[PDB]
Symmetry: C3
């Protein structure tokens, strides 16, 4: 919907940093179905060590941090330009000021409790949609674990892709789409 969908738009421009600024295209759509958020995620590297995959990396990580109002923190690895409520296949003209209804519930997934089993959704996605090339995806809710002397978030969602033990050298890091849901804050 419009106010019920917070997304990166369906076909985003490079909008996130896996290793270098805007080195990847993250497609993330959060659809509010009341108490739970229905999400679909996919990622594609466009430059750097993941395009194509080199021998120095066997995982990629992205941490999205939000303030108490569900707004992206200033030093976000996800570019804020096209992260907004939906309007057709694009986004609202003006930046949202509140998206708490899309945030991961703090009672279900307490802050810093990323080690807690429940705060993690773990599954396999596939490189280039190829069934013979599995990649483990671990989604952690409100795990954050602030990077020492930095600015703390109220909420966070982290994506961790791991292909340890596989030789995908020279393949472009691109994953199949994956669906998951989580309990909303309100």
């Amino acid at each position: 919907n419009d106010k019920l969908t917070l997304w990166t738009t369906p076909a985003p421009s490079p909008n996130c940093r896996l290793n270098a600024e805007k080195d990847a295209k993250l497609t993330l759509v959060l659809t509010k179905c009341g108490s739970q958020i229905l999400a679909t995620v996919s990622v594609l590297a466009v430059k750097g060590s993941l395009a194509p995959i080199s021998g120095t990396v066997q995982s990629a990580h992205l941490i999205i941090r939000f303030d108490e109002n569900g707004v992206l923190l200033n030093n976000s690895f996800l570019d804020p330009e096209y992260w907004n409520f939906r309007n057709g296949d694009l986004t609202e003209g003006t930046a949202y000021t509140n998206a708490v209804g899309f945030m991961p519930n703090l009672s279900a997934y307490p802050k810093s409790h990323g080690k807690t089993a429940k705060s993690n959704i773990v599954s396999q996605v596939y490189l280039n949609g190829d069934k013979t090339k599995p990649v483990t995806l671990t989604i952690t809710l409100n795990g954050t674990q602030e990077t020492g002397d930095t600015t703390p978030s109220a909420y966070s969602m982290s994506f961790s892709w791991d292909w340890s033990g596989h030789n995908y050298i020279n393949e472009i890091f691109a994953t199949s789409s994956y669906t998951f849901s989580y309990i909303a804050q309100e």
Copy 2:
């Protein structure tokens, strides 16, 4: 819902062609949750080479094609009789004329881009719901790839089940239920 649910009904009669006309029962329910469609799919072969599985087949495929209005194309492998909006545990008496809101988004999954990682959802389902008998399911959105000199679709959803490397000879091809979501066209 009624207009928010497009389905095969919950307990369909043979309604699709995996190899021969009406040789399988496809249960597919598309529930519209605004920007995303929540879906559940299951299939069961009722006759032919998949009931029971013989030695000449190690995969099964079904391609559903729709026109610009989200209506099934005339030569559909899915029988149109019970493919309609919901009414209780059955379908509306009259054939729908528009279901674009249930179609896979053309910006997220551009036509012919079935090779694109993002247009694919890949996971494992289980034969007869048995954890020891995995079957890989690859769902491709708007991949279509028109069969040469034929009639082109505006949208498509294809299901590909593969059990290469497994000996399921003499087992009936029937899968466990699987949930997935995708970005809607509107």
Copy 3:
């Protein structure tokens, strides 16, 4: 939502019996999206043979039974105290009398047909959210299979976790969160 969400609350107290009374915390949220119910489930053992896992058990099972009105049967392995419609991060003050809209559809998943492939959703969850410790989860809808001379249910949902072949002795039985959907009765 409120009346569209039937849950255990997001951070429940010990509320279910895997082996002994209240030996586990089951977090189960059922969100109604019309024709389908979107669900997220997670479990954590707090005492007994699963906290930590001993050598006499390689699986855990929980069967939730409901009457014709979608109300928990009296001898429920799930404690009824905090199983109700949502109100913030808690539950309605008074016990619900009808939740048929959250029950698994009897046409899609006929009673006693738990052996039927379609009535089963099978996937892998991970112990302590650790990708190296898979646990198979089999969810069976309306399988029930009444325990001989007892009281029969109109609907049921059973969860079966199995780690046969793995040595998780001394690990606490706690799983990552998992999302699934099923066709609602109405």
